[PDB]
């Protein structure tokens, strides 16, 4: 179906402990494929998925140089934002930025993104038109006017409509055996007695890729949304993900409960029950 490429930048000042650290990671869908860390003994863009390793030295040098330049650029930006908020030189602050593109099954641009936060709070974002900005406050308006004068939105649009989708398409083909393979969840239902009155039914999904999944409990065919404990989807470390959903049921009523699983890797949606 559709696919995404995203870069995630984190720039963190640390007064008294050297200059701000700059980390960049790149993802295609839920697969990380590159990383950069300015704290590394020798900072370079480094592969994190096998299918990117076939890119040649020019690729690695170019993406390394952009990241080293960004290390300096984001240090300038941190100094600037400290001033925009009248903050002292003593505190640690964080700029985060996410940017990238979504493409459809036919590879055409669906939407581009560029969004920034300061100390965990939304700061400035490129609107969906790839042409105008939404600034969170009067400090971000300074960045907005700076980027408007520099026609920076036009530069984002050119990147997002060109290089972003072109290289995403290349990555998807080069890594098609994994990036374009959905692995279904392996599922089971467990039963954990609580008391003579109640027991927990837990519906498990293991080993699935990508992370998008829907796990729900129904009681007599009605969703138990408010009564379902739904753990955050979590990585297994082998590219796959794990999730479970649990509901507390009255003893003897277990067969009124069904777990429903939807995932791209599944031939059809699953309906599971406790099987004692």
């Amino acid at each position: 179906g559709s696919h995404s490429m995203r870069y995630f930048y984190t720039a963190m000042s640390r007064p008294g402990r050297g200059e701000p650290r700059f980390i960049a990671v790149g993802y295609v869908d839920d697969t990380q494929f590159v990383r950069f860390d300015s704290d590394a003994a020798s900072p370079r863009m480094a592969p994190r998925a096998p299918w990117i390793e076939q890119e040649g030295p020019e690729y690695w040098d170019r993406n390394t140089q952009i990241s080293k330049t960004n290390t300096q650029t984001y240090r300038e930006s941190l100094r600037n934002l400290r001033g925009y908020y009248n903050q002292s030189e003593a505190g640690s602050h964080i700029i985060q930025r996410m940017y990238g593109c979504d493409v459809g099954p036919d590879g055409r641009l669906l939407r581009g993104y560029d969004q920034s936060a300061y100390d965990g709070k939304d700061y400035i974002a490129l609107n969906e038109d790839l042409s105008s900005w939404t600034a969170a406050d009067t400090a971000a308006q300074i960045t907005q006017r700076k980027w408007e004068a520099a026609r920076e939105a036009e530069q984002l649009r050119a990147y997002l409509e060109g290089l972003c989708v072109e290289w995403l398409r290349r990555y998807l083909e080069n890594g098609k055996e994994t990036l374009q393979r959905a692995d279904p969840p392996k599922t089971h239902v467990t039963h954990h007695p609580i008391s003579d009155h109640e027991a927990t039914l837990r519906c498990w999904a293991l080993g699935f890729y990508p992370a998008e999944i829907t796990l729900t409990w129904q009681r007599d065919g009605e969703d138990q949304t408010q009564d379902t404990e739904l753990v955050e989807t979590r990585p297994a470390g082998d590219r796959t993900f794990q999730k479970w959903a649990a509901v507390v049921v009255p003893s003897g009523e277990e067969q009124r409960y069904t777990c429903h699983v939807q995932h791209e890797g599944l031939p059809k949606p699953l309906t599971l029950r406790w099987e004692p």
Partner: peptide, 9 residues
Amino acid sequence: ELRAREESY
């Protein structure tokens, strides 16, 4: 592929 030539904030 990263975007180059970013303007500072």
